[PDB]
Design a protein around this ligand. Structure first.
Ligand SMILES: CNc1ccccc1S(C)(=O)=O
Ligand SMILES: [Zn+2]
Length: 140
């Protein structure tokens, strides 16, 4: 589990979106596993605007933050998980690290702020759904 709380937006894995998120929907992309909903209270997170390939991610299934190198956002084939079939995913950044289903929503952050959230796992890789291209997150 996990979300980015940036202004009056909640960014979550699309597959973990609640009824409330769908009922307060701003934007969703299945290919990216991202869903954004509206909030009443303002949030404490800032979005990275950058092409950093190093940062730190939270891994709930280790209760640990790990420093990682990660690929630039790409179109990647993802094998089957408890929450999705084998399929392609867009704006997905891969690193060497531990990821299980419940780790989805863990923040990846660089010196510039939040880069993305854990989206995929398996074979000792972790995949992050990038949000740094979503400039509209910063305003309105
Ligand atoms: C939809 N575009 C796309 C697809 C795969 C990964 C990243 C991108 S991009 C060039 O926008 O970073
Ligand atoms: Zn950065």
């Amino acid at each position: 589990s996990g979300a980015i709380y940036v202004g009056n937006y909640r960014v979550v894995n699309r597959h973990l979106a609640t009824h409330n998120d769908w009922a307060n929907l701003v934007w969703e992309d299945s290919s990216r596993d991202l869903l954004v909903s509206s909030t009443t209270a303002q949030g404490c997170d800032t979005i990275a605007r950058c092409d950093c390939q190093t940062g730190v991610y939270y891994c709930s299934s280790r209760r640990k933050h790990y420093p990682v190198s990660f690929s630039k956002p790409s179109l990647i084939f993802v094998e089957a998980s408890e929450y999705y079939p084998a399929r392609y995913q867009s704006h997905l950044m891969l690193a060497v690290g531990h990821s299980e289903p419940g780790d989805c929503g863990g923040i990846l952050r660089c010196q510039h702020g939040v880069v993305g959230i854990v989206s995929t796992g398996g074979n000792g890789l972790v995949g992050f759904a990038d949000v740094r291209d979503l400039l509209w997150l910063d305003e309105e």
